[PDB]
Amino acid sequence: LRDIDLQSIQEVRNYLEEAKAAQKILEKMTQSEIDKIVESMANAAREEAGRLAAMAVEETGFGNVEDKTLKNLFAANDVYNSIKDVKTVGIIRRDEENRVWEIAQPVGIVAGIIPSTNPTSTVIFKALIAVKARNAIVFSPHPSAAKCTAEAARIMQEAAERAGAPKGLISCITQPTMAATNELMKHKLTDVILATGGPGLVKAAYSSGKPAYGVGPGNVPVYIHESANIAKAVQLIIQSKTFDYGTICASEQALLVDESIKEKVVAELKQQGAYFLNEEEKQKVASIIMVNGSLNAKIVGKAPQVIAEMAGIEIPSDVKLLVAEETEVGKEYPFSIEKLSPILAFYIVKGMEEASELAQKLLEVGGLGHTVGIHAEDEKVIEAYTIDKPAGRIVVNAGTTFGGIGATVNVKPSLTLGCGAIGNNITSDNVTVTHLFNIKRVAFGVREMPKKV
Amino acid sequence: LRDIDLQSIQEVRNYLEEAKAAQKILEKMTQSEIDKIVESMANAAREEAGRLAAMAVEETGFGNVEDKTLKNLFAANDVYNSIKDVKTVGIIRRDEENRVWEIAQPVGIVAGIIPSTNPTSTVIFKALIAVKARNAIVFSPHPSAAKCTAEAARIMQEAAERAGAPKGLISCITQPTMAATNELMKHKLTDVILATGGPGLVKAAYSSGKPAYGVGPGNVPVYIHESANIAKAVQLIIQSKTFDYGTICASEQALLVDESIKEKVVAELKQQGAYFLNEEEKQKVASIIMVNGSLNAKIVGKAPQVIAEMAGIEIPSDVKLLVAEETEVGKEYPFSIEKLSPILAFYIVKGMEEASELAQKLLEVGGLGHTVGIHAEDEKVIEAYTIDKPAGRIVVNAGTTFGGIGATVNVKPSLTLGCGAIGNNITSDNVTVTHLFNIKRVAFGVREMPKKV
Amino acid sequence: LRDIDLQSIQEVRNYLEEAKAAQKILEKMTQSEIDKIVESMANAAREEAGRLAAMAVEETGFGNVEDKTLKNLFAANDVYNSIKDVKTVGIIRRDEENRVWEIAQPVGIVAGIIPSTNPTSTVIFKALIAVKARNAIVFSPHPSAAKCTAEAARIMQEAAERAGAPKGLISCITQPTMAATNELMKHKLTDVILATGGPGLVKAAYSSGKPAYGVGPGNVPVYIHESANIAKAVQLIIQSKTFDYGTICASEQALLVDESIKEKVVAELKQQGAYFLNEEEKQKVASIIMVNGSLNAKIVGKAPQVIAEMAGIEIPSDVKLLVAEETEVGKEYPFSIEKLSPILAFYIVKGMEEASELAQKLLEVGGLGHTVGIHAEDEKVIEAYTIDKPAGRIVVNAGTTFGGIGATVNVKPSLTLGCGAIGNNITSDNVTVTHLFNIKRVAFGVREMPKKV
Amino acid sequence: LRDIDLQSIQEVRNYLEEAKAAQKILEKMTQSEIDKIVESMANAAREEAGRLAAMAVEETGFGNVEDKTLKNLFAANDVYNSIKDVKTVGIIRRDEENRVWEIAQPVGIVAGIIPSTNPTSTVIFKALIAVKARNAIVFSPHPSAAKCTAEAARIMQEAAERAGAPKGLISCITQPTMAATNELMKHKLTDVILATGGPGLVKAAYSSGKPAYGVGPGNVPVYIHESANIAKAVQLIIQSKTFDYGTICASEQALLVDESIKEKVVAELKQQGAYFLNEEEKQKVASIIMVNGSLNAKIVGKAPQVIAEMAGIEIPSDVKLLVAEETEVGKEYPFSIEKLSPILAFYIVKGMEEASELAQKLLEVGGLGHTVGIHAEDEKVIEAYTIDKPAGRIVVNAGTTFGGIGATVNVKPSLTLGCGAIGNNITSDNVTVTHLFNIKRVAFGVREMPKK
Ligand SMILES: [Mg+2]
Ligand SMILES: [Mg+2]
Ligand SMILES: [Mg+2]
Ligand SMILES: [Mg+2]
Which residues lie below 8 Å from residue D426, measured CB to CB, with a gap of 6+? Predict the structure, then answer.
């Protein structure tokens, strides 16, 4: 075979056949044996966190090395700790009085689609949950992130083998193509797809004929209520928003601010490193946010100074993020969409009801089912505001990046955030190890069936 | 007539838009208002169980009215009782230690695909679980069951309306066509597909671009170990196998019997109404079990006497099931496949190990992930036999029809039995109300994110 | 509004069924009855040519009324004269020495796809050749020209009918949709597709499952050799290029001019109304020629003054066309593409070999198999230049608009110009009446077949 | 084996790229150089006719070696003779009074789809007409005839190359797959599809995005009018019908016979080797004509004795064809469909009018646009009968096999019989060399364009 599309198809087929053999071997191991493999994988991810981070920044041009290192550690530490004690081998629950017990059943071979924004960390995370549940996994990288994705996969497989795992358990397409992605998603041997990517790739996953856990995009609106701790709220928002220069789907995109505290919030934002664009600077930044009707890849995950330069504006070197005041919401209004960069929209609101109506509109521009935030000290207000928001993660008094993924609030640590039915997803959960094994129920007859009505 | 396809598309579009408006109204109600609607629906199903049963037998030619009535009552009583106390409105859980509230979120509009074998009971089952989780539902019948399916939906909607539900909540396609099925599965307003049907239609649901809960087919092997109470085992098996003349996917298809108790088992089966075919009779029956290389629809749900007539053999009028001693397994051995009728294969085995190898082979002929059975009093044998069977329902000392669906063993009452990844499904659960709402998590800041490494 | 797609499908189905019935009636008529019908149609077109021209300019904003009026007359007169004496009924050829005779066989129902640039004239031309060949025809308009296209079809039907034609012989989709176009191209009653449109629609026609005659796009290069009558060649070029403000695919897009007459040709161009853009103005005009990577629709068929304003430059009010001197060819050099407007590129060449090289490059930019031109009085040069050019119409000493369609050179009058295999078409012919009937051959035994080798 | 699909796709891409290069070199040759290449090809086909015939019978199980040898010679002789003097290089026509020239332009690369019934003869025919028009051609065989089809191709290429043709001009997919068929039909470099096969491949060819010449199936009804020379009609009918055991699409499938001569026709048929089935025998043969609502592949191109064994009937050795009297027409009546084997239907009619009505109904069962036949000496009846038949080939006083392909009546020699719009084809012509080059017209200004 000479041509790269055919070669990539053959490569996927080889990987899946090898994965099938590897998973048969893995399924026979004890819980201790599995847990030892997962622990070794987590240890290698930890050791390799910085180096993988630097590969990703260099290859993709997104983000910064210190934050990608922390993203990798989040996968190596937080994800690992949330699954290390989960029972995944044999009988995992007995219910003596109902005369049922539950047996864990691996799904088999998982197809992992990896994003360009979180390439190495998503590999670490998916490799850990897949292998803990006793599956093999075959990865498909984004073409912009092919080399670092593959290196992360190799490190996981080699760490797994050192602890006794079989060859071919963890693999990665080396030459990404549409043909190979299509083969991986539709192949006979593929059992479950974990599709972490854009809406089109997720749509393909749910068109594949295979069971799939997809995600949806975010466009996270955050309400700062007049009861907020303003300095703390601003601190949390800025740390979350500028993390890896805004590459995570759960990051803040718009602030909705009660008019009674707007002056204080602005001053606090400015003090903590935000640059407020004037009407002319806003137009110039706006004109590079979108090209040809969608987000400009060239601003994704870029420092505020790089964005400033691209837009032809002039800012201080210590600026942490750009902010623009906004009144409108929609695709024709670039500051109201998901920006995946250190840029925030700033909407003034009269109170909670106007905030909710704006939040609903912003979610409808490419954020349904994903994440919202609120900063407030009034529980009544928090309860009334949050109850009807279409998001699987409703983050209170925390940065939405770190809350969404379960770093700083107690949802399951994950880099695959299901957006529920409203987001065209099978679940609203943070996807984790329990999504990658089936439960079999052994159940005894305890009632008699009548055969007369 | 030329344009029934276009009219059926239009009808789907009308139902979904009416379903959209209805669900919005439903979603605003209290738990008690929802529960009153569900209760009224259950009551009406109970009252109409016999009339729906009769419509289904006459229209499809499958089964008998007594058993179909019981099947409807299973949906009206067992399913109702298993969901009536489930919380589905608002905050369903507050986790004070983890600082997380769980909010129940309806998926929206469910597309319910209905099989020709369990037409009215599946409608009852799906309508109850859909409405209890605060959804609208649009049904799609098999063409050979369009009238009884639509009548069951009509009765569910009228019952719901009587107790306060909005018009348009529950609807059913009246003119089934490929175009309409396609429209329903792919339409922008459809949120989740419940696909109960053949592997073809389920594959279509997982190809639709939408989240789906599919099923897989059964081909249930049942092991009678030498330790079994033989009279009781045979009774449970015959009651289950002949229920509705064998139309339920969980019903027994092959018995695997320890040689040491073969003669007793055969004699007990004969005593309880089984007719063992001789070699000439076997071959005549085998000829009408499949046409092309697939199950012959004309024997599905037929009394033994009808089948005898079809195969041109004669049998006593009191015969309850046909049995055929067999040694081979494969698509080309018609007695080893799923027969969906009162025909049972009979395999002799030396012990448990040989039983497992045959069970495994039978499941591979179109039963993976579905159901298995075993009859035994030796607990260690039970434990050893059951641990490695690829079936979501592993039924011990009960009829597999009634065990699988949760009538006589404690799995969730359901007529949509997921077969997990091994059967191309997103779950191995008995599908129930918890599969039709997403959980949103309101989660408070409880940890700090480290700024550096 | 929601169901306009479904209504348009039903509309197509009605038209096709009525056309089938109409065509059956028409096929039984004599040659003289057919010719009377065709004559009536042509007279009606001749009478309506001005009115339909004004409708098309009004609805599409392309071109001008005087030139569209002449375009309609081309179809009502030239096309009509080229077919009125063609034999299309019964035996059309007798070969007595070969013992064979030919019988004309109508193709049946023709699907005619109509462009936005030539909406009324293409309808006239197609209706004439279809009915002359004893076919029915169902038209599909471009959306931006639906009204004037439908009105042209109506006038043709009513004229046919006045002369004795059946109802439903000529029809037109009134609400164009993708669904209707698809239905028309693929319907079981559709016999032959005339696809006059962009490469996307023609590709759809060759993917329809049906026999199709398509076109390709033009990008016509014209060589002015030093032997040319310069005043006459510039006059021919200008009249052709500015006709309907350059909407026709066969219109000149680039001039290739011998260095030795460069100054004379430039001067002659200016004298006859050409405005040569300077570097400043070039860049401004280029900015509006392409939006995204394709031709800007807003310049199509616009007077040079409109284009000047759009580009924000000032030109004298008597300017008939803009000209830009160029050296590069390719899809990123906007002056080298097909411009469908009164803009002309202008290349200097040392002589014939460099002219050929450039013409080949220019046709590769979206003109393959369509049209080329040369002005020259040297016969040897004409022969050597034309022999190897990939164009079905090779126009000598004439404007290419009028030449390509057969107004001023002797190719068959047509508005559907096949670009041959090189342009992804079944023919390189100017499509006309002989493409719309099949020939049947009645042939007698004249030789004996050997029985043995 | 797992990835033969991928290998076959790569093979197609290699052939197309080499085809491209080859055609570019071929296009520069003189008419004289082209004609020498074509002649050399036709010579080699002639020499290899018997050998190819034996391979095809062995590989496919269809027909017999003698008739297949004749079929290959028809391509090597009749097709060659019909194209060898056609002008195809450069300027092919000049017109001083209209001031127009015509230049022949090769289509480029031809994808030739080859049926299982005529596998080697169709390769010879398509290669000759494609290379004569100065094209390259890539063949796609039916899986049942892969080896003999590739060998026919190899022989043409070798012969062409001996006479100076470039490498890669003529090629053939060696392992047929769906993937490879799809690739060849849809590839960027493919210019024209010649689709000779069942309605399904033909549909795929007109669904490919590419210009295509398809065929349609035959179901040829033949009318024997009371004015016919009966002994001669029967002979022509039997020789045509039994040729290669009935594998050619133009072959007779049903006789429509004037009541007034019925007895003589029956007697004459029997005398010339026909076996008339009794009612019981008819039911048994009917039972194996159709399998699963379509023509049973297992009777295609089989001797009548072989068909007799399959049906459980007993017939003499010297029988040449089976005949059944029939009254009904439709898919539910196996004797009324296209049988591609030495089986004929026998209908009695009162006269021409019932014959036409019957002929129309038989064509609507899978024969539209293809071929029809009549045997008669009354010129007026011939004219009256033929004028309204929807067939591109209307064969008079000849066997329809040999008439339809142009062996024994003057239509262009061809094994790709277009069935017109009524047969879902772009033409009703016997496809030949002129369908494989475009005409470019060099045309001079002769008129002025006005205003108002
Ligand atoms: Mg699998
Ligand atoms: Mg929705
Ligand atoms: Mg037709
Ligand atoms: Mg080409």
Answer: C211, C212, C426, D211, D212, D213, D214, D418
| Phi and psi, residue C27, nearest 5° | -65, -20
Contact: C392, D441; criterion CB under 8 Å:
yes
Strand-pair category, C220-224 with C321-325: unpaired
Which residues make Cβ contacts (< 8 Å) with residue D52, sequence separation at least 6? Answer: D68, D72, D120, D148, D151, D152, D155
Which ligand is nearest to the Cα of residue D135, counting in written order? 4
In sequence order, what are the residues at sequence separation of 6 or more whose Cβ sits closer than 8 angstroms to the Cβ of residue A364?
none
Q: Which of B193, B239, B409, B414 should be substituted to probe chain A, the one whose Cβ sees the most A Cβ atoms within 10 Å? A: B409
Q: Which of C3, C9, C13 is nearest residue B13 as measured by Cβ atoms?
A: C3
The CATH number assigned to the domain with range A221-404 reads 3.40.309.10
Q: Which residues of C touch B13 (CB under 8 A)?
A: 2-3
Is CATH 3.30.450.40 what the domain over D1-215+416-452 is classified as, yes or no? Answer: no
Quote the ligand 2 centre to B110 CA distance (angstroms).
10
Specify the CATH superfamily of domain B1-215+416-453: Aldehyde Dehydrogenase; Chain A, domain 1 (3.40.605.10)
Q: What's CA C430's distance to the chain center, in Å?
A: 8
Structure tokens at B277: 């075919």
Residues A26, A176: Cα–Cα separation, whole Å: 27
Tokens matching residue A387: 């109850």
Characterize D196-213 residue by residue with b for buried, 16 or more Cβ atoms within 10 angstroms of its Cβ, and e for exposed. bbbeebbbbbbbbbbbbb
Q: Which residue of D has its CA nearest to A11?
A: D3
- Domain boundaries defined on chain A: 1-215+416-453, 221-404
Distance B210 CA to ligand 2 centre (A): 10
Instruction: Choose the mutation target among C1, C6, C182, C189 for the interface with B, i.e. most B CBs under 10 Å.
Output: C6
Chains that touch B (3 or more CB pairs under 8 A): A, C
- From B183, B211, B212, B215, select the one nearest B197 (Cα to Cα): B215
DSSP state of A450: -
* Residues of chain A positioned with their CB less than 8 A from the CB of D13: 2-3
Q: How far is the CA of C422 from the centre of ligand 4 (A)?
A: 5
Residues C13 and B7: their CA atoms lie apart, in Å, by 14
Closest C-alpha to A100, from A111, A88, A91, A113: A91
Q: Where are the beta strands (DSSP E) in C123-264?
A: 136-141, 170-172, 192-195, 212-214, 220-224, 252-258
Mutate to test the interface with B, among A70, A400, A449 (most CBs of B within 10 A): A449
Question: Which residues of C fall within a CB distance of 8 Å from D444?
Answer: 396-398, 409
8 Å CB contact of C453 and D391: no
The last residues before gaps in chain A (C-N over 2.5 Å) are none
Q: Which residue of D lies nearest to A7 if distances are taken between CA atoms?
A: D6
Q: How far is CA B271 from CA B235, B321, C394, in A?
A: 10, 12, 94
Residue B44: C-alpha distances to residues A89, A149, B77 (Å): 45, 57, 11
| DSSP of C301-359 | T--HHHHHHHHT----TT--EEEEE----STTSGGGS---SSEEEEEEESSHHHHHHHH
Q: Do B394 and A445 touch (CB under 8 A)?
A: no
